[PDB]
Amino acid sequence: LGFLGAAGSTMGAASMTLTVQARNLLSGIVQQQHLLKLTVWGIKQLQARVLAVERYLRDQQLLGIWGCSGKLICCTNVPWNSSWSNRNLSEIWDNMTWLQWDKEISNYTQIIYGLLEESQNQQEKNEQDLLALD
Amino acid sequence: LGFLGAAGSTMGAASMTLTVQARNLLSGIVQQQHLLKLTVWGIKQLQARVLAVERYLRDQQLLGIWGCSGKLICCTNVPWNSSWSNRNLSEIWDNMTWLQWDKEISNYTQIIYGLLEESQNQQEKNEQDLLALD
Amino acid sequence: LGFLGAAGSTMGAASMTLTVQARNLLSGIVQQQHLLKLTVWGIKQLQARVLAVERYLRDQQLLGIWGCSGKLICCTNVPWNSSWSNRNLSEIWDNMTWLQWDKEISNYTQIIYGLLEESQNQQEKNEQDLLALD
Amino acid sequence: ENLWVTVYYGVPVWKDAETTLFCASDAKAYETEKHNVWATHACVPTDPNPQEIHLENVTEEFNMWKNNMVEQMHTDIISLWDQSLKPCVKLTPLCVTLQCTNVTNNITRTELKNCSFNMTTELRDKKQKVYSLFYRLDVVQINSNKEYRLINCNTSAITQACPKVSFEPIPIHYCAPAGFAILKCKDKKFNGTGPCPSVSTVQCTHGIKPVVSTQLLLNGSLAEEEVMIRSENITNNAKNILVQFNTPVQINCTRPNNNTRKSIRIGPGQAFYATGDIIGDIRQAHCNVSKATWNETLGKVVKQLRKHFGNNTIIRFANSSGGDLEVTTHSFNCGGEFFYCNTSGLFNSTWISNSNDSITLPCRIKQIINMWQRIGQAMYAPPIQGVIRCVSNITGLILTRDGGSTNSTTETFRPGGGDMRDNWRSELYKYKVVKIEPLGVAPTRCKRRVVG
Amino acid sequence: YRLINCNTSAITQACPKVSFEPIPIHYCAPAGFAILKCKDKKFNGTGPCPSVS
Numbered sequence: 001l002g003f004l005g006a007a008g009s010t011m012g013a014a015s016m017t018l019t020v021q022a023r024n025l026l027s028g029i030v031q032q033q034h035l036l037k038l039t040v041w042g043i044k045q046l047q048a049r050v051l052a053v054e055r056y057l058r059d060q061q062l063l064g065i066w067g068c069s070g071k072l073i074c075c076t077n078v079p080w081n082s083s084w085s086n087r088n089l090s091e092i093w094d095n096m097t098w099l100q101w102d103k104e105i106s107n108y109t110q111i112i113y114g115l116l117e118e119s120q121n122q123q124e125k126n127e128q129d130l131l132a133l134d
Numbered sequence: 135l136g137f138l139g140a141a142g143s144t145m146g147a148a149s150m151t152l153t154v155q156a157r158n159l160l161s162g163i164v165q166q167q168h169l170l171k172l173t174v175w176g177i178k179q180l181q182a183r184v185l186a187v188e189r190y191l192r193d194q195q196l197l198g199i200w201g202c203s204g205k206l207i208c209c210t211n212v213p214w215n216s217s218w219s220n221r222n223l224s225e226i227w228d229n230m231t232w233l234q235w236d237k238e239i240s241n242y243t244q245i246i247y248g249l250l251e252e253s254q255n256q257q258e259k260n261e262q263d264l265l266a267l268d
Numbered sequence: 269l270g271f272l273g274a275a276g277s278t279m280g281a282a283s284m285t286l287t288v289q290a291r292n293l294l295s296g297i298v299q300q301q302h303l304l305k306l307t308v309w310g311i312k313q314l315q316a317r318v319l320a321v322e323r324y325l326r327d328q329q330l331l332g333i334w335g336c337s338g339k340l341i342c343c344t345n346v347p348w349n350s351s352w353s354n355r356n357l358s359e360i361w362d363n364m365t366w367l368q369w370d371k372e373i374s375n376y377t378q379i380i381y382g383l384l385e386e387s388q389n390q391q392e393k394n395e396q397d398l399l400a401l402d
Numbered sequence: 403e404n405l406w407v408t409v410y411y412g413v414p415v416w417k418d419a420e421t422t423l424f425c426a427s428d429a430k431a432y433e434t435e436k437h438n439v440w441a442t443h444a445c446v447p448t449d450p451n452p453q454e455i456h457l458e459n460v461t462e463e464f465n466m467w468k469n470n471m472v473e474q475m476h477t478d479i480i481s482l483w484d485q486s487l488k489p490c491v492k493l494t495p496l497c498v499t500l501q502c503t504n505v506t507n508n509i510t511r512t513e514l515k516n517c518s519f520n521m522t523t524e525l526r527d528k529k530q531k532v533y534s535l536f537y538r539l540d541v542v543q544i545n546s547n548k549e550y551r552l553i554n555c556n557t558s559a560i561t562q563a564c565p566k567v568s569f570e571p572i573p574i575h576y577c578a579p580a581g582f583a584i585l586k587c588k589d590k591k592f593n594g595t596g597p598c599p600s601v602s603t604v605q606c607t608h609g610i611k612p613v614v615s616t617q618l619l620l621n622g623s624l625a626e627e628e629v630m631i632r633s634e635n636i637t638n639n640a641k642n643i644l645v646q647f648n649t650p651v652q653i654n655c656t657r658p659n660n661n662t663r664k665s666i667r668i669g670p671g672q673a674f675y676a677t678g679d680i681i682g683d684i685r686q687a688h689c690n691v692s693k694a695t696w697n698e699t700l701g702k703v704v705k706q707l708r709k710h711f712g713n714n715t716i717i718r719f720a721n722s723s724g725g726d727l728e729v730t731t732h733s734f735n736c737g738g739e740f741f742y743c744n745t746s747g748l749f750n751s752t753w754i755s756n757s758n759d760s761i762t763l764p765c766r767i768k769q770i771i772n773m774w775q776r777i778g779q780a781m782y783a784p785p786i787q788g789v790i791r792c793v794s795n796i797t798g799l800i801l802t803r804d805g806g807s808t809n810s811t812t813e814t815f816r817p818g819g820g821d822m823r824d825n826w827r828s829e830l831y832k833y834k835v836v837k838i839e840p841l842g843v844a845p846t847r848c849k850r851r852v853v854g
Numbered sequence: 855y856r857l858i859n860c861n862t863s864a865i866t867q868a869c870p871k872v873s874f875e876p877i878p879i880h881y882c883a884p885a886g887f888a889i890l891k892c893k894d895k896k897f898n899g900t901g902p903c904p905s906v907s
């Protein structure tokens with residue numbers, strides 16, 4: 001459980017400790033640490049540190065437009081379409097690893113993302129027009 | 135409306151879809167993709183990717199100290215000063231593009247920013263001293 | 269008070285203006301600004317700009333998993349252990365600079381961080397399982 | 403119905419991909435010796451605490467002959483070799499008509515030449531003659547009094563390696579960047595590449611050293627069981643075969659020649675370090691192998707090849723048929739100078755169907771080299787003044803085809819290490835990096851506030 | 855005679871249009887760091903400077 005401890009465990013047990021996975025990835029790699037410094041290792045270190053933040057910030061930009069700036073688990077007001085999966089409540093959470101589930105939505109994973117921005121943020125932050133001051 | 139679709143449209147219509155504009159900018163440019171790699175294109179790629187995140191994070195640092203960590207539209211508790219603009223409610227929102235408005239506050243745009251940090255965060259996060267536990 | 273104005277002042281007075289300190293650090297350094305550009309200054313500029321964001325984002329990743337995505341001051345639901353400090357309410361806040369306090373918890377500062385992720389986020393975002401929809 | 407969708411940041415899913423890595427080595431030599439050709443002058447130091455986590459219930463499919471970690475390793479060492487040789491003395495005014503004669507053998511094997519030439523001195527106006535020595539095959543005849551020629555001047559340039567550069571391989575960890583992880587296989591019998599059931603997610607690899615060897619790998623890693631056999635393709639005899647030793651055979655190589663550093667200033671500052679007169683007799687270089695310990699290793703290999711290769715055919719172990727003297731002999735850099743010990747003596751044994759003597763091998767030394775068939779630029783190896791000994795563990799074997807035998811029986815695998823990338827595969831057969839995706843959506847009745 | 859350098863090291867003429875006049879070169883700190891300057895006049899040796907900027 002020190003890192004990816006529940007990679008093979010159930011999606012429910014993996015959902016119990018998903019903080020750990022998030023903590024190590026951005027921070028990890030110990031990047032922090034003749035006269036030249038133009039060596040082949042330093043240039044592989046810098047670009048490896050650039051995608052470090054540019055893959056982190058690629059994901060953190062998505063949660064910000066979903067109301068999840070500082071939450072590891074948002075429940076979003078987007079209804080689930082039956083075409084994406086036909087399995088019941090306890091059918092997936094007590095049976096599949098997150099690995100199996102990632103390939104089962106990888107086909108229509110982009111369709112979900114586009115709809116998440118519309119109802120949870122594009123409309124929700126607008127619904128306060130009549131409720132902010134009245 | 136795929137990107138900047140309402141650049142020339144009203145500030146109200148542009149405010150209806152401002153999610154789109156935000157999504158593409160951080161992600162955009164498809165940065166992700168003899169033996170050397172020290173070419174003139176790679177160095178123009180890396181620095182172009184550095185300002186990508188260092189202009190994004192220059193803006194995202196401002197919304198964080200305004201209570202808007204993960205909201206595209208915050209209504210802030212700072213009163214509007216009449217000296218900044220004399221036009222009525224429906225006078226600007228039904229008449230000006232965001233382009234015109236950006237030059238009309240560009241003079242006193244910094245004065246707004248300094249005041250936004252004080253009342254919405256510097257005082258608000260302090261007002262809980264007597265209300266958090268009591 | 270333009271920057272670090274209360275470095276030597278009380279922790280309470282320093283807590284009155286901690287916005288300022290936060291604003292300048294990410295933005296600061298004016299990084300934004302023969303035919304080659306491979307000089308010794310440019311390479312010291314780029315890596316100095318990389319740790320700029322990779323030390324900022326090293327800290328901002330911690331506040332996100334603490335419910336503090338866009339707040340400078342969160343009150344966290346983690347109880348304080350007496351072993352960390354024996355001093356009373358007004359004993360530290362009216363007497364010590366933040367400098368003195370940083371060395372007084374630097375021994376057990378990591379123990380606090382690990383516990384902050386568990387009760388404020390690892391359990392709190394889970395407590396909505398029975399309260400989200402019911 | 404009435405089910406909502408929910409977002410999860412911190413999910414453990416990944417997809418097979420490869421990106422850039424970096425070096426990791428702790429405090430090794432620094433002051434007592436420095437200017438290493440591999441660890442450069444400074445690399446990212448590894449932490450003494452090993453980053454390891456055992457993964458359970460997971461069975462990710464690795465690949466070794468399609469793994470891109472060996473590809474980045476292959477290309478990293480190449481660009482690293484040239485980076486450590488560019489700022490060193492070039493040897494261009496060393497291509498002049500050489501007039502040599504055989505060494506003093508009491509008017510009676512030869513292998514070396516007491517040669518001379520004239521070069522540039524500190525002043526471009528003046529010239530100077532100096533007598534040095536060279537090795538055979540480093541020179542080939544032109545057309546009385548023998549007049550010779552450096553073999554490289556016919557094809558490519560030449561640049562002498564720096565004298566204070568250490569050519570000893572040290573452990574160089576390859577650790578994954580942020581948002582990625584190197585999966586190592588913990589299953590002992592990892593035949594070929596398939597689904598390894600026992601997986602560990604480690605951030606830094608183990609102490610991997612860049613042993614530049616040929617036919618016979620040295621100082622490799624292994625973790626028990628029968629001597630493992632790995633092949634990209636077992637049915638195709640044409641493909642190469644990597645072999646791993648359940649236990650290493652302690653070998654010793656050395657040259658008995660007692661040489662002397664003869665520095666001669668070419669141009670302003672540069673100095674060409676050549677061989678002087680050899681003091682204290684002349685002898686041939688050799689590598690010893692434990693004869694009793696080798697007969698057990700060739701027996702364990704043929705045993706596990708048996709159930710792999712029909713277990714009915716005849717074993718025919720022969721010398722490396724064909725090839726070049728540098729690609730068929732056990733070529734390796736040791737102690738500064740480059741050895742090429744004669745392999746043909748080891749594989750003479752044939753075993754089929756059911757204080758102590760040690761076999762030795764004749765070896766020669768070469769100073770002109772441009773390894774891995776890189777024809778761009780060659781380098782001269784300064785003779786290391788004094789004594790030389792190698793004494794390394796051998797842990798691997800590289801075996802190649804056995805002709806186009808049409809059915810019938812009778813066949814084995816004679817040694818060939820035609821490719822340098824395969825040498826690094828003996829350490830990276832279990833490693834594969836994956837692109838971690840921390841985003842994962844899943845449905846559950848669950849919604850936030852209605853209006854906000 | 856003889857150039858003294860040819861005995862030891864190489865030689866490369868400096869470019870004629872290169873200005874060898876020293877100009878003020880500020881050393882400024884990166885982001886997340888700060889250069890503390892002492893304002894105390896009599897800073898004997900190195901100790902605790904009371905007046906810091």
Ligand SMILES: *[C@@H]1O[C@H](CO[C@@H]2O[C@@H](C)[C@@H](O)[C@@H](O)[C@@H]2O)[C@@H](O[C@@H]2O[C@H](CO)[C@@H](O[C@@H]3O[C@H](CO[C@H]4O[C@H](CO[C@H]5O[C@H](CO)[C@@H](O)[C@H](O)[C@@H]5O)[C@@H](O)[C@H](O)[C@@H]4O)[C@@H](O)[C@H](O[C@H]4O[C@H](CO)[C@@H](O)[C@H](O)[C@@H]4O[C@@H]4O[C@H](CO)[C@@H](O)[C@H](O)[C@H]4NC(C)=O)[C@@H]3O)[C@H](O)[C@H]2NC(C)=O)[C@H](O)[C@H]1NC(C)=O
Nearest residue numbers: 505506507515516517518531532533534535678679680681
């Ligand atoms: C590998 O190859 C290298 C290179 O050798 C190359 O070819 C040889 C022929 C020679 O020309 C080299 O210069 C050339 O680079 C070998 O290294 C050389 O080996 C040779 C082997 O013969 C050595 O030659 C001996 O040198 C003796 C000393 O001469 C040195 O100093 C000379 C000037 O000094 C003068 O004053 C000193 C005293 O202060 C006297 O001792 C010296 O004689 C001079 O008067 C200088 O010109 C030389 O180059 C050298 O630096 C010299 O005494 C020997 O000659 C004698 O004795 C020999 C037997 O030992 C005999 O065979 C010779 O015929 C000769 O007899 C007569 O001696 C008279 C003395 O005055 C002389 O006047 C006569 O002319 C001479 N008879 C005739 C005619 O020949 C040798 O000449 C040489 O020193 C080595 N290199 C150096 C340091 O220069 C190397 O050994 C080879 N490998 C191996 C391991 O074999």
Ligand SMILES: *[C@@H]1O[C@H](CO)[C@@H](O[C@@H]2O[C@H](CO)[C@@H](O[C@@H]3O[C@H](CO[C@H]4O[C@H](CO[C@H]5O[C@H](CO)[C@@H](O)[C@H](O)[C@@H]5O)[C@@H](O)[C@H](O)[C@@H]4O)[C@@H](O)[C@H](O[C@H]4O[C@H](CO)[C@@H](O)[C@H](O[C@H]5O[C@H](CO)[C@@H](O)[C@H](O)[C@@H]5O)[C@@H]4O)[C@@H]3O)[C@H](O)[C@H]2NC(C)=O)[C@H](O)[C@H]1NC(C)=O
Nearest residue numbers: 434570571613620621735736737787788791792793794795
């Ligand atoms: C596969 O793995 C194997 C593992 O064995 C690798 O094989 C060999 O493993 C050996 C393990 O000991 C390595 O041995 C080392 O050898 C170096 C040799 O450096 C000598 O020469 C240097 C340069 O020459 C100068 O000095 C000499 C006089 O020696 C002089 O004639 C020359 O003109 C010139 O001035 C010197 O800089 C260096 O000091 C040394 O003389 C050796 O340095 C290592 O030293 C250790 O062991 C020695 C002998 O027991 C011991 O004295 C050392 O003690 C301390 O003090 C000395 C003297 O001041 C100091 O130099 C040391 O730093 C210490 O402070 C020390 O314990 C060691 O013997 C070998 O390099 C390695 N490689 C070879 C050749 O095979 C194998 O390489 C791997 N795979 C393959 C095939 O690559």
Ligand SMILES: *[C@@H]1O[C@H](CO)[C@@H](O[C@@H]2O[C@H](CO)[C@@H](O[C@@H]3O[C@H](CO[C@H]4O[C@H](CO[C@H]5O[C@H](CO)[C@@H](O)[C@H](O)[C@@H]5O)[C@@H](O)[C@H](O[C@H]5O[C@H](CO)[C@@H](O)[C@H](O)[C@@H]5O)[C@@H]4O)[C@@H](O)[C@H](O[C@H]4O[C@H](CO)[C@@H](O)[C@H](O)[C@@H]4O)[C@@H]3O)[C@H](O)[C@H]2NC(C)=O)[C@H](O)[C@H]1NC(C)=O
Nearest residue numbers: 721726727728730731742743744745746747748750763764
């Ligand atoms: C790395 O090292 C290896 C070490 O093996 C080296 O391999 C050498 O390869 C070369 C070229 O390929 C070989 O070169 C020649 O081999 C000749 C073959 O022998 C003829 O004459 C035989 C009599 O020789 C006696 O010794 C041989 C062993 O060489 C032995 O088999 C014989 O029984 C006999 O005792 C003759 O018998 C033989 O054929 C008859 O007998 C055999 C065996 O019973 C039978 O099967 C046949 O049907 C037939 O009846 C054949 O006709 C050899 O003659 C030749 O030179 C020899 O004589 C000269 C002159 O005196 C010597 O100087 C020399 O040392 C030999 O004794 C030459 O050797 C060579 O044999 C291989 N191995 C060595 C070194 O012996 C690799 O090339 C090396 N790699 C590199 C980088 O070079």
Ligand SMILES: *[C@@H]1O[C@H](CO)[C@@H](O[C@@H]2O[C@H](CO)[C@@H](O[C@@H]3O[C@H](CO[C@H]4O[C@H](CO[C@H]5O[C@H](CO)[C@@H](O)[C@H](O)[C@@H]5O)[C@@H](O)[C@H](O)[C@@H]4O)[C@@H](O)[C@H](O[C@H]4O[C@H](CO)[C@@H](O)[C@H](O)[C@@H]4O)[C@@H]3O)[C@H](O)[C@H]2NC(C)=O)[C@H](O)[C@H]1NC(C)=O
Nearest residue numbers: 467594633634635636637638639640641642806807808809
């Ligand atoms: C490791 O890699 C190796 C790569 O070789 C894989 O090895 C496989 O080995 C088997 C051994 O039987 C091969 O089987 C045959 O290969 C033939 C190659 O085709 C050559 O000839 C073609 C035509 O040329 C002329 O001669 C042929 C001779 O049969 C005549 O039939 C023809 O009329 C012509 O006169 C060329 O077009 C081609 O380029 C080659 O030069 C195949 O021809 C042969 O096909 C037979 O079987 C087929 C499959 O059942 C069938 O569909 C055909 O009709 C025909 O009956 C047969 O495939 C494999 O080809 C070879 N693989 C590869 C990649 O070629 C090895 O499998 C792998 N590792 C493993 C899994 O162990």
Ligand SMILES: *[C@@H]1O[C@H](CO[C@@H]2O[C@@H](C)[C@@H](O)[C@@H](O)[C@@H]2O)[C@@H](O[C@@H]2O[C@H](CO)[C@@H](O[C@@H]3O[C@H](CO[C@H]4O[C@H](CO)[C@@H](O)[C@H](O)[C@@H]4O)[C@@H](O)[C@H](O)[C@@H]3O)[C@H](O)[C@H]2NC(C)=O)[C@H](O)[C@H]1NC(C)=O
Nearest residue numbers: 083084085100101102103104105106107108109110111112
């Ligand atoms: C994820 O989705 C992909 C592709 O689906 C696309 O993307 C989604 C989001 C939708 O927009 C779809 O409309 C898109 O098409 C699926 O890929 C399928 O993979 C299989 C296996 O590789 C493909 O099967 C092929 O079958 C060929 C033979 O056709 C036979 O049947 C036809 C029809 O009767 C007949 O005409 C023909 O004669 C044959 O009898 C075969 O040659 C080929 O090699 C291959 O096996 C299939 O075509 C792919 N999908 C489509 C519709 O193209 C993934 O399976 C899916 N995964 C999950 C988990 O859902």
Ligand SMILES: *[C@@H]1O[C@H](CO)[C@@H](O[C@@H]2O[C@H](CO)[C@@H](O[C@@H]3O[C@H](CO)[C@@H](O)[C@H](O)[C@@H]3O)[C@H](O)[C@H]2NC(C)=O)[C@H](O)[C@H]1NC(C)=O
Nearest residue numbers: 498499500501502518519520521528529530531532547549
């Ligand atoms: C560099 O070395 C070369 C040889 O590789 C020099 O060229 C000539 O080499 C011959 C070899 O015998 C020298 O021999 C001399 O010949 C003359 C006349 O035949 C004879 O009288 C001498 O006793 C001796 O045998 C010869 O000196 C040398 N030069 C000439 C003019 O032929 C070459 O000169 C050397 N340096 C350079 C490049 O100038």
Ligand SMILES: *[C@@H]1O[C@H](CO)[C@@H](O[C@@H]2O[C@H](CO)[C@@H](O[C@@H]3O[C@H](CO)[C@@H](O)[C@H](O)[C@@H]3O)[C@H](O)[C@H]2NC(C)=O)[C@H](O)[C@H]1NC(C)=O
Nearest residue numbers: 465466591592593594595596597631632633634635636637
């Ligand atoms: C490691 O061992 C496994 C078995 O546990 C090997 O997998 C099996 O290998 C055989 C022989 O290579 C395969 O049979 C052959 O398949 C080829 C096509 O690849 C076909 O052309 C031949 O006619 C024959 O059927 C077999 O399919 C394969 N898989 C299974 C499930 O048995 C594996 O090859 C060994 N090597 C590795 C991966 O290191």
Ligand SMILES: *[C@@H]1O[C@H](CO)[C@@H](O[C@@H]2O[C@H](CO)[C@@H](O[C@@H]3O[C@H](CO)[C@@H](O)[C@H](O)[C@@H]3O)[C@H](O)[C@H]2NC(C)=O)[C@H](O)[C@H]1NC(C)=O
Nearest residue numbers: 658659660661662663678679680681682683787788789790
């Ligand atoms: C490799 O060759 C060198 C150089 O010949 C050897 O070094 C020499 O070793 C001897 C051992 O006794 C040293 O001792 C004595 O020196 C005196 C005075 O010069 C001499 O008169 C004696 O005959 C004897 O040589 C000697 O000083 C030393 N160096 C020299 C200049 O010869 C070395 O021993 C040889 N191989 C190795 C590493 O053992």
Ligand SMILES: *[C@@H]1O[C@H](CO)[C@@H](O[C@@H]2O[C@H](CO)[C@@H](O[C@@H]3O[C@H](CO)[C@@H](O)[C@H](O)[C@@H]3O)[C@H](O)[C@H]2NC(C)=O)[C@H](O)[C@H]1NC(C)=O
Nearest residue numbers: 891892893894895896897898899900901902903904905906
């Ligand atoms: C600047 O002035 C201060 C005093 O305001 C100096 O501090 C004191 O310096 C003296 C002499 O260096 C120290 O006494 C000596 O200490 C050494 C060990 O460092 C010891 O071996 C001698 O026997 C002697 O006791 C004294 O301890 C030191 N500190 C204090 C509190 O008085 C300072 O050295 C001057 N130089 C600088 C820092 O520019």
Ligand SMILES: *[C@@H]1O[C@H](CO)[C@@H](O[C@@H]2O[C@H](CO)[C@@H](O)[C@H](O)[C@H]2NC(C)=O)[C@H](O)[C@H]1NC(C)=O
Nearest residue numbers: 704705706707708709710712713714715755756
């Ligand atoms: C070499 O082959 C023999 C027989 O061909 C092996 O003996 C066993 O033979 C039976 C029946 O043919 C097989 O079912 C067994 O699998 C064989 N043994 C095993 C464990 O493979 C003999 O074992 C083979 N060589 C060795 C020593 O493994």
Ligand SMILES: *[C@@H]1O[C@H](CO)[C@@H](O)[C@H](O)[C@H]1NC(C)=O
Nearest residue numbers: 082086087088089403404405
């Ligand atoms: C189970 O799945 C069926 C469709 O296969 C669906 O109609 C049903 O509503 C699901 N069960 C629940 C708990 O709603």
Ligand SMILES: *[C@@H]1O[C@H](CO)[C@@H](O)[C@H](O)[C@H]1NC(C)=O
Nearest residue numbers: 503504505509510512513548
């Ligand atoms: C020197 O060795 C070469 C090697 O080919 C040979 O051709 C030549 O005859 C030898 N000369 C003498 C006299 O030994």
Ligand SMILES: *[C@@H]1O[C@H](CO)[C@@H](O)[C@H](O)[C@H]1NC(C)=O
Nearest residue numbers: 652653654690691692693760
């Ligand atoms: C290598 O040298 C060591 C020195 O102790 C010796 O024990 C060993 O037997 C040698 N091995 C061989 C066969 O070279």
